[model samples]
Target: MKKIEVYTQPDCPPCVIVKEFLKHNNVAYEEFDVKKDAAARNRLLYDYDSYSTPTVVIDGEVVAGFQIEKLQQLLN
Candidate 1:
């Protein structure tokens, strides 16, 4: 199984688009709204070391930002 965690925050345009693509392409993921969830924010900073939105973590491997090609490569 692909364990994907998509770290995101509100008002991020890229994050929104990425999520829609994921769903459209049938890529399952868990989304995190950073500011609203302390644990999610803590998890992001603790493990991923980025405060940026649109971070994609697939099976413990992290891909930062909206790098669509690489994200799809990993998904593949």
Candidate 2:
């Protein structure tokens, strides 16, 4: 099974789109609201060094943004 985690926040347009893409693709994932959870936000910075919403971590690898091709490649 593929492990997918999406970090997102409120009023983030790309976050919403990335979320929708995951749903539409029927990919199982865990969603984290960075704004609400301090630990999660910290993990993004410490582990992934990600400072933006819509950041996706797939099986220990971080995908920078809503790069569809990269996302797909990572999945497959």
Residue 23's lDDT within candidate 2 is: 93
Clashes in model 2: which pairs?
Answer: none
lDDT of candidates 1 onward, in order: 0.86, 0.86
Clashes of 2: 0
Misplaced by over 4 Å in model 1 are none
Model 2: CA > 4 A from native = none
lDDT of 2 by residue, 9-62 (tens): 999999999999889999889998999999888988888988788889999899
Cα error of candidate 2 at position 14, Å: 0.1
What lDDT tens digits, residue by residue, belong to model 1 across residues 1-76? 2399988899999999889889988987888899899988988888788768888889888888889998889997
